[PDB]
């Protein structure tokens with residue numbers, strides 16, 4: 001499939017090797033998450049710096065976000081949230097999650113209230129991922145900007161040190177775009193600096209930030225990292241993941257709303273197959289796990305490394321047929337999604353409100 | 363002697379350093395100018411005993427014309443597409459306030475407007491309206507020219523008895539100049555004292571700094587974002603002359619100056635109401651921001667702000683440019699002493715009189731290019747006396763020195779009284795003016 005080792009060279013990032021993974025295990029005392037064991041999160045920037053601080057009792061915080069969608073969230077979207085939740089638990093650090101409602105308002109046909117409405121709704125799905133309410137701040141840009149003595153100030157600092165020419169290349173803007181889009185990159189970068197959240201870190205500016213993201217986003221975070229020293233702040237560290245495969249690449253992906261029945265259908269009739277044409281060729285040459293979306297999905301959601309390896313072998317040999325594989329996946333997805341919907345149902349307005357209230361995170 | 367020559371050079375270099383600090387010069391440029399000032403003063407301390415004792419272009423940053431008579435304001439009205447203030451509008455304001463039209467209105471200083479009749483309609487129908495004006499902070503760089511908008515705004519507040527919001531654009535200063543946020547905010551708080559000293563009613567006036575208020579308002583940023591969606595980069599390149607090499611902060615700044623035009627940007631003052639009419643007093647060089655704001659308003663469901671535009675108080679050197687702290691010897695500062703005011707008028711105010719007293723007696727003076735006379739039209743409140751001075755100077759009966767002496771007698775008390783009032787502005791009063799809260 002995709003040659004991720006080349007993307008590392010292309011972007012200039014660092015490969016997450018076994019020694020780093022072992023160091024993470026020693027620092028936390030926890031077994032490394034399966035995304036690390038399987039190369040899902042394979043690249044980074046300054047992770048050793050983060051561990052240097054952590055090992056010396058100098059904590060950091062996590063930062064991630066989400067563009068509020070009209071309840072159009074699929075299993076692929078779970079990846080960074082699942083990893084961020086794991087990072088939060090094993091390092092036991094605070095986390096800030098930005099809901100870019102102002103971004104959606106600027107890019108989509110929505111009123112400011114509708115954009116905000118989508119953000120609060122999406123927040124429920126994020127809360128359903130299990131983040132600890134005592135250490136997690138989920139904020140709406142539209143709301144938080146007007147109730148922070150540090151966020152806007154950081155936005156302006158960034159705005160002063162980034163030119164249109166710079167963002168034009170990185171984000172592909174043209175002078176036909178509204179000024180709101182042009183300066184937005186500063187708002188997405190501001191959360192990377194601790195003094196943007198006074199209610200959490202007060203006036204401290206030395207608390208390193210760690211951002212889990214997709215490798216193809218490295219160019220975007222490069223802007224934030226380059227501006228950091230220019231404004232006297234530490235650069236945020238990054239952890240890069242691979243690309244979540246499209247079902248093939250309403251039926252282009254499996255949504256967190258889909259029912260058990262819908263999940264079955266999606267996998268059996270739409271999930272791309274890496275097996276052979278006829279059962280004759282398959283029992284001989286076997287199936288290819290590098291392109292079979294059904295198996296790739298398993299590498300992300302099946303936690304048992306042993307069962308996953310067994311399924312791989314039998315699918316590559318021919319002993320196991322595509323239909324058998326797709327059923328193994330369905331047995332993994334149905335409960336995964338069912339449990340998410342169940343937890344989402346428990347998210348009360350009182351809960352979402354608390355998560356969204358700027359407050360100290362003991 | 364040569365010792366005098368040294369003294370003058372230090373004064374000149376000092377005036378230069380002051381203008382640089384007031385303009386957009388970088389810290390390095392300023393530092394280099396200072397090193398010379400310092401070096402030039404060290405040489406004086408030696409060669410002496412003591413140390414040393416002391417076509418028309420109009421946009422938000424520049425006012426330029428080659429005409430000694432200044433900007434052609436009627437033409438500017440056509441170019442900007444605004445409306446001339448006629449006798450009937452003035453008479454209507456008089457009937458609505460029961461007050462004599464301010465002399466700025468009577469003499470065509472505030473000569474242009476946008477929707478003033480909409481404002482009067484609302485007022486006469488018992489509907490509320492609020493005033494909004496602003497200032498780009500700069501440590502004691504405020505000159506007499508700055509009094510035009512502020513004196514008039516205070517007059518409007520008095521005769522209409524309406525609330526007022528004054529924006530101190532410290533973020534604008536931070537984006538365009540070389541300074542820290544604390545410095546920028548500091549200048550906002552200082553200039554605020556100059557403003558308050560104009561006499562604004564503390565029960566109806568809210569003065570806010572962008573840097574500080576943006577982070578404590580449930581409505582300001584939301585309006586900024588709404589505005590930002592309806593203005594393209596191309597549009598601001600055409601209106602303000604921005605380029606692709608400008609920082610993104612400068613490019614979106616226009617939305618910040620537009621936001622105060624909408625009442626719900628101030629929830630602590632007007633709650634959630636979005637129908638409060640807004641009137642914006644300013645010199646016409648600020649119109650670009652609001653012509654843009656007016657086109658955006660209906661797209662986001664708000665009323666268009668009305669405007670009242672004033673002409674420019676000219677630079678001492680002549681009406682070719684406006685008075686500006688950025689230009690050497692161009693301004694008469696609110697911090698100047700009586701002696702300084704006197705010296706600036708006599709030594710720098712461009713004269714429309716003849717070269718010789720003989721020629722002056724024979725041909726008289728030209729009030730259309732004489733800076734001292736122009737200044738009188740702004741501050742000499744007595745119309746008949748203004749007219750008498752005009753006739754006498756024009757006939758040659760009055761000499762330039764007499765004309766300048768009359769102006770000096772007007773400017774000294776004007777500024778001295780301001781300083782007297784600024785001296786009474788305590789840190790508690792400034793903090794109260796800048797505290798968001800309901801306005802009586």
Ligand SMILES: Nc1ncnc2c1ncn2[C@@H]1O[C@H](COP(=O)(O)OC(=O)[C@@H](N)Cc2c[nH]c3ccccc23)[C@@H](O)[C@H]1O
Pocket residue numbers: 494495496497498499507508510511529531534619642643644645646647648672673674675676684685686
């Ligand atoms: N020579 C002159 N003669 C007469 N009036 C003059 C002269 N020079 C300046 N002005 C007027 O003074 C006010 C403040 O000037 P600023 O350049 O600080 O102004 C600025 O830098 C703006 N970004 C601040 C601002 C924000 N919101 C506003 C709303 C209305 C007016 C101004 C603002 C203005 O009314 C300006 O027109």
